[PDB]
Amino acid sequence: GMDPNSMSLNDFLSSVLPVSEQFEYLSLQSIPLETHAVVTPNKDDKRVPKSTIKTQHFFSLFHQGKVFFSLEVYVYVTLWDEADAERLIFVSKADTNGYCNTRVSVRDITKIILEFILSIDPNYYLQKVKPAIRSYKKISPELISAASTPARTLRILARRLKQSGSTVLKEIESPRFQQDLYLSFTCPREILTKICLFTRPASQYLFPDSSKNSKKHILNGEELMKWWGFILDRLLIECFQNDTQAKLRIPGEDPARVRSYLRGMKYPLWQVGDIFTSKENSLAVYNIPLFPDDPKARFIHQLAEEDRLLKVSLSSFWIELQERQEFKLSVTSSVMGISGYSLATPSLFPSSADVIVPKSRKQFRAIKKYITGEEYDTEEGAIEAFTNIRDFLLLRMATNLQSLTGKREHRERNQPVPASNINTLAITMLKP
Amino acid sequence: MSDQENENEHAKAFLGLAKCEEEVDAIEREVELYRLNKMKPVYEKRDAYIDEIAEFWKIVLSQHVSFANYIRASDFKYIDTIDKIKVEWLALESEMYDTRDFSITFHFHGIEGDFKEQQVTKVFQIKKGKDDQEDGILTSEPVPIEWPQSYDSINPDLIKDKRSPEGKKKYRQGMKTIFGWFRWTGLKPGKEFPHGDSLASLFSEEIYPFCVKYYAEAQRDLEDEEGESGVDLPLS
Amino acid sequence: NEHAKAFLGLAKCEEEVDAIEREVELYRLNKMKPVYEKRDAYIDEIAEFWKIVLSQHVSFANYIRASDFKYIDTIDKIKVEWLALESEMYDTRDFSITFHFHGIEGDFKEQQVTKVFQIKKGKDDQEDGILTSEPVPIEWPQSYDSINPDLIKDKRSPEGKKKYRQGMKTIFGWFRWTGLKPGKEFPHGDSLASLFSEEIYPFCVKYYAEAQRDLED
C-alpha cells in the first residue's frame, strides 16, 4: 500500500540479464479503465460483475542505443458482488527485432517481467479508476469533457476568461471533484489468477519488417508455441501452487499430438484443453474471452456478423477458427491458459521506478507507437525507436530512460545466488 | 433477343454509363472548387483569431496523433515554435492546378542560440505519370530552410561526405526530421524524407482545416480525457 | 478580452463551416440528380444489373438471410431520392428509397415499395442525430408467411418467438424497421440504409464492373 517494498522491476530484470552489461528499459502503463466484461455475458447468468478494470503494460528493452525487445500485456481485474474477485493476465505479444548484439535469454526476460506483473497487488489498479462514463450533468460550473463540441469548448473558455481571467477551474483539484470523477474498489490480495496466450506466428509484429532483417530468427508456429510453453511452464513451477490448472490446445490438431508436446513440461498438471468454462451448453460466445488484437475475438466478431453466435459451440469453434484462412493459424498455432493461486500474496504497488503512466491514452499511444510503428528492415529503425523514446521522455515527461546493469552468469558460485543475496539483506537489515 | 442486338444494347448502355461516371468526376471537382472558394474568406477570418492566440499551433501539433509519427521526437523542440501555418489552394488561382494542389507557409518563432526565426513556403502539386491513370502523385521541389544548430551533425549542408559510410548514416538521420521534409520532392524514392506526401496531405486535409478541433481537445479539464471525443448485444 | 474575443470568433467560425458543409452537400446533390437519372436510365437497359450488384456486395449479404436472395434477385429498379432537395427542412442525409420487385409468379408479388429515412435529433447523444424510418407496407413471399409477422399466430409460443425473430431478420422485416424500437427490429436497419444511400446506389456501376472483373477471373 503506502509501506515499503523490496522487490522492484529494476531487480527482476537485472537478475536475469548478463552480468556487467548495460540495458535501458521502458515500462509503460495505461491509466486503469472501467470497461466491458471480458467474456460476453449471459442475459440470464449465475453472477453479474460489479465492475471490470483494464490496464495495459508495455515493455521495451534497449542495448547500446537500439531497441530490441518488446512485451505487450493487458491485466484485467474482475469484481463480482457476491462471487469474490479474480485477475487475468492476457499476454498479447512478445517480439524481438534481432538488433541486439550481445546474447541474452529472451525466454528469461519475458518470464521475469511476467513474474513481476504477478507480484503486483491487484488493489494497485483499483485506487483511482477512469470510469467508463463520467456524468457531468451533476457538476457546476460547466466542464470541458470528451463530448464537448469545439464550439462549446471555445465558448466555455471565453466565459471563463471574462469572469476569471483564467481558463482553469481551481475546482477540479478539489476533494469533491476528484472523488466523483474516479472510481475506487478493494479486493483481496490473494485472488484467483488466470493467464491467457495465443501463439500464432502472424501475431509477431511488434517490429514491422524485422523479418526482412537477416539477423532475426523468425519462429514457426511449432517452435513459437514451445518457446512460450517453456516460459509458462516455469511460471507454474515458480509462481503458482502445484494444484494450478494448465491448459494447452492446438486447434484442428488431435489431442494425442497435443499431448505429445506436453511431454516436455516439468510442471506435472499440464492438460490438453483450455481454461474456459462450459456455460450455455458450451456455446462459444458465452465462454470465449475477447482480447485486443486476439484471433479468438476476431472470429467471434465475424460470427456476430454472420449471426452465427448461436450456432457455434466451443468444440466447433476451435476447428472453424483453424479452417478460416483469414485468421491464419496455419503453422500449428496454439492456445495456452493458466488458472490458480500464486504462492506469494502479491503485495507490490509499482513505484515511479517500476512504471511510467502517461497523462492520457493519447500520450501513452504516442510513446508506444515510437516503437511499434518504426520500420525494422534495417538497423536504423532500432536506433530511431531508441532515440525517439529517450528524447520524448525527456522533452514531454521530464524523464530519463532508466538504466540497469545485469548481474547474472554461468553459476559456478560458492552458494546459491538466492541464498547469497538474502545474507546481504540480513546484514544490512539486521545491522549487526 | 438476338445475341447480337442484345450484345449491342449493352455496349450502348455501358458507353452511356462510362459517359456518366465522367460527369460524376467533373462534378466532384466542381464541388471541390465550390467548397474551396466559400472557405477562403472563412479561413482568413479564422486564421486572424488564431494569431490572437499564442501557442495555438504548438498545442495543435501536439494534439494530432499521426503527425508525431512522421518526425523525430526531438523535432518537437522546433515544432513548438511554429506560430503560423497558412495553406493556399492553387486551383483557386488557376484552373490548371489540381484541386489537391497547394502552397503551405510556416512561421517559426526561433529559439535563442539554436534555431533561427524564419518563414518557409513549400508547394505541392500533383503530377500525372505517363501510362499511369493513378490520378497522379503529389510532388514538390526543395525549399531553403535553416536547420537548428543542434542538427549540425545531420544537416545535409554541413555533412562532409554523403557517400562515406558514416556520412550516409548521418544524412539519412537528418532526412527523417521535419527539416529533411522541406527538401522532399517525391521524385527520388527511398532517398528522401519518408512519406513526405502523406505528411503534406496530413496538413492540407486535416491539420490546417481542422486545427480548431484539435485545439479544443487539448482543453479538456481532465488530463486523461484530452484528447478524445465520446463487445455485443447478441439477441434481437 | 482580446484573448476571449478570439475564442468566440473561432466558435462562430467553426459554425460557419457547418453551414458550408450542408450548402456544399446540397450543391453536390443537385448536380448529381440529372446525372443519376441519365445513369439510371442506362442501368435499366441492363436487365440483371441489380441482381448481379447485390450478390457481389460483401456487407449487404451479411445483413440478410441466405433465403432472402430468392427475392433480392427479383429487384430491378432502385431509386434513391435525397429529400433535402425537396425541402430545406430535411437533413442532407435524408432520403427515400424505392425498390421494384419482379416478384415470383405464385410466391412473391411484383411490387414497388418506398421507404424514407430521416435523421431525428437527440438531447446531446445525437452525434448529428440518428436515422429513423416508419414501417412501409410490403407483401411478403407466400413461403415466408410461416414467419410473416402480420400472419403469425402467437409471439409467446416457443415456436412463435423463433419465427417472428427469423422474419424480422429478413429483408422484409427491414421494411418495418423504424430505429425507435431497440432490440425489437431488424438488426442494424440504419446501417443497411446508409449502405444503400452512401455505397450501393451511388456506386452500383463500379460494383457491377468489379463483379464482371470477378467473373472473368
UniProtKB/Swiss-Prot annotation, chain A:
InterPro entries: HAT_RTT109-like, Histone_AcTrfase_Rtt109/CBP, Rtt109. It comes from the Eukaryota. Changing residue 205 to S: Decreases histone acetylase activity. Increases sensitivity to methyl methane sulfonate and hydroxyurea (genotoxic stress). The modification N6-acetyllysine is found at residue 296. Its EC number is 2.3.1.48. Changing residue 294 to N: Decreases histone acetylase activity. Optimum pH is >8.5. Residues 8-410 form the Rtt109-type HAT domain. One of its GO terms (molecular function) is histone H3K14 acetyltransferase activity. It is found in: Nucleus. One of its GO terms (biological process) is protein modification process. The keyword Nucleus applies. It catalyses: L-lysyl-[histone] + acetyl-CoA = N(6)-acetyl-L-lysyl-[histone] + CoA + H(+); L-lysyl-[protein] + acetyl-CoA = N(6)-acetyl-L-lysyl-[protein] + CoA + H(+). Keywords: Acetylation, DNA damage, Nucleus, Transcription, Transcription regulation, Transferase. Acetyl-CoA binds at residues 94-96, 103-107, 198, 202, 217-219, 227. Disruption phenotype: Abolishes acetylation of histone H3 'Lys-56'; simultaneous disruption of GCN5 also abolishes acetylation of histone H3 'Lys-9' and 'Lys-27'. Decreases acetylation of histone H3 'Lys-9' and 'Lys-23'. Decreases HTA1 RNA level; simultaneous disruption of HIR1 or RTT106 alleviates the effect. Increases sensitivity to methyl methane sulfonate, hydroxyurea, and camptothecin (genotoxic stress). GO terms for cellular component: chromatin; H3 histone acetyltransferase complex; nucleus. It holds the Pfam family HAT_KAT11. Changing residue 318 to A: Increases sensitivity to methyl methane sulfonate, camptothecin and hydroxyurea (genotoxic stress). Induction: Expression peaks in cell cycle G1. Histone chaperone-dependent acetylase that modifies 'Lys-9', 'Lys-14', 'Lys-23', 'Lys-27', and 'Lys-56' on histone H3 (H3K9Ac, H3K14Ac and H3K23Ac, H3K27Ac, and H3K56Ac) to promote nucleosome assembly, genomic stability, DNA repair and transcriptional regulation during mitotic S-phase. Its residue selectivity is influenced by the acetylation status of histone H3, and also the presence of histone chaperone ASF1 that shifts selectivity to 'Lys-56' when H3K14Ac is already present. Present with 1140 molecules/cell in log phase SD medium. Belongs to the RTT109 family. This is Histone acetyltransferase RTT109. It comes from Saccharomyces cerevisiae (strain ATCC 204508 / S288c) (Baker's yeast). The gene is RTT109.
Swiss-Prot record, chain B:
Signal peptide: none annotated. Present with 3120 molecules/cell in log phase SD medium. It comes from Saccharomyces cerevisiae (strain ATCC 204508 / S288c) (Baker's yeast). The C-terminal part interacts with the N-terminal part of histone H3 and promotes acetylation of histone H3 'Lys-9'. Disruption phenotype: Decreases acetylation of histone H3 'Lys-9' and 'Lys-23'. Simultaneous disruption of GCN5 abolishes acetylation of histone H3 'Lys-9' and 'Lys-27'. Abnormal protein sorting to vacuole. One of its GO terms (biological process) is protein modification process. Changing residue 18 to I: Mildly decreases RTT109 activity stimulation. Belongs to the nucleosome assembly protein (NAP) family. InterPro entries: NAP-like_sf, NAP_family. This is Vacuolar protein sorting-associated protein 75. The lineage of its organism: Eukaryota, Fungi, Dikarya, Ascomycota, Saccharomycotina. Homodimer. Homotetramer. Forms a complex with RTT109; consisting of a VPS75 dimer contacted by two RTT109 subunits. Interacts with RTT109; the interaction is direct. Interacts with ASF1. Interacts with histone H3/H4 heterodimers and heterotetramers via histone H3. It comes from the Eukaryota. The modification Phosphoserine is found at residue 2. It holds the Pfam family NAP. GO terms for molecular function: acetyltransferase activator activity; chromatin binding; histone binding; identical protein binding.
